[PDB]
Amino acid sequence: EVKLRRQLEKHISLQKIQGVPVVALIVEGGPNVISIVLEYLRDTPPVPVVVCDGSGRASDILAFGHKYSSLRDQLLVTITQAQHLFIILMECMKKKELITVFRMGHQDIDLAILTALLKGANAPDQLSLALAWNRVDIARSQIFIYGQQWPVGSLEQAMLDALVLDRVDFVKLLIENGVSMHRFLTISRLEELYNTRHGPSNTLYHLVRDVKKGNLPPDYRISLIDIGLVIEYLMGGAYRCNYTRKRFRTLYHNLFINHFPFPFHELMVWAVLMKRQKMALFFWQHGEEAMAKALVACKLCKAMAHEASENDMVDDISQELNHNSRDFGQLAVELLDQSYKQD
Amino acid sequence: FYKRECVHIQLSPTDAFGTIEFQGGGHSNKAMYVRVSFDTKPDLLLHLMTKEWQLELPKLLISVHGGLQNFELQPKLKQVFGKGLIKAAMTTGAWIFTGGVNTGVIRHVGDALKDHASGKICTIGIAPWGIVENQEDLIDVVRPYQTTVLNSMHSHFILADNGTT
């Protein structure tokens, strides 16, 4: 039973993620708990353990950690029994650094767990784990420290992975940490962002299939000319798309310096296209000539809602129509009022 | 006119005299930038700050000196220090002379100013030309200067031609 549970847990932890972390919590307990601590440390290097205020075996391990490496007499009094306890206590004190310590500093249990996991895992890996957990606080307090190695080139990949997900606050943290979209964004990165199916579902594929009006491969790669065509369809008459232009077409043919002068505009367009409200609002906050793109977003969301209502679709259009375009319109109106007030 | 009037260094003529906007963080923080020589003409600097950059003479002037070493700042001390400095600068509408190098106490000062900015305090950052992260980047035109680099918060930057760093 116990052996089977331990074997199953160890096997599961080996599954690729990199590796799923494991943390053990102990609340007092008998000497079997101490032997289990020793066995867990021996079995795998990543076997962090957190001590609890509960009196018992946890108290003995906490005392051993505090003593680190009179005391022997006190341990014997607390405990042949003393020798048996010391046989495990020596290992516990020797490896006390790996084992986490809890007391009544580090009051927050969640913070203690996060710190213990970060220490045990042994910072691209720490940042990736924090992003996976969806906890900006731990990354800011723990993942971000002076003198961090931060290998060149991995941070951009992490930024792209975060953009794929809906971790808006993580994007804000990276931007405030010095991660600049101005140079990071590239044509291939934007194409991958558009084509990726990870994250919340979007109806762009339906629109593309409608626009081309021709047989298309299943899950065919979506290019920027196609998205430009879809933008033309939804926006309305005239207003030729910047993507469907001769100079951009020449650039696209040559590429397949590939960095857009106004990346915020394209990022806002992508976010609105894939139905991500918070990202759209943030990119509206930080971009330039905000009112124009706010009006564009209002128009485009209204067009999307109408198109969805026309054929098939679900009730989500009701959520969009008057609560996505409407919000952008109200924002534009407020900005106009403020500008008129100032001058 | 400044390039002909001011020569920055044996000896080298003119050079620099170009503002750079630090569009690295949330705030671009556009600022002036001029690289004067080790020898300075008080009239030249006074006219450039008052007239060329259109800055009114302040009723108060502050010169701040601190170590270049980077050390952690005490929380209790810093909490009062930043708030008091920001309040005094805003009330006086005064120029603040500080080191142009981000590293050191200046860093905390700039951060405190940033945390208390969002008054348009007209600071003045003076640092050696050699300490600049990318001296050649400045080369008068707007320069990106992506965020050792100088602090972005400080405005009306001046520098000295110290040659070797």
Curated annotation (Swiss-Prot), chain A:
The lineage of its organism: Eukaryota, Metazoa, Chordata, Craniata, Vertebrata. It comes from Mus musculus (Mouse). Homotetramer. Interacts with TRPM1; the interaction results in the formation of a heteromultimeric cation channel complex that are functionally different from the homomeric channels. This is Transient receptor potential cation channel subfamily M member 3. It comes from the Eukaryota. The gene is Trpm3. Residues 1-17 are annotated as: Calmodulin-binding. Constitutively active, non-selective divalent cation-conducting channel that is permeable to Ca(2+), Mn(2+), and Mg(2+), with a high permeability for Ca(2+). However, can be enhanced by increasing temperature and by ligands, including the endogenous neurosteroid pregnenolone sulfate and sphingosine-1 and suppressed by intracellular Mg(2+). Implicated in a variety of cellular processes, including insulin/peptide secretion, vascular constriction and dilation, noxious heat sensing, inflammatory and spontaneous pain sensitivity. Disruption phenotype: Trpm3-deficient mice exhibit clear deficits in their avoidance to noxious heat. Trpm3-deficient mice display reduced hypersensitivity to thermal, but not to mechanical, stimuli in carrageen-induced inflammatory pain. In the chronic constriction injury (CCI) model of neuropathic pain, intraperitoneal injection of isosakuranetin or primidone do not reduced heat sensitivity in Trpm3-deficient mice. It is found in: Cell membrane. Belongs to the transient receptor (TC 1.A.4) family. LTrpC subfamily. TRPM3 sub-subfamily.
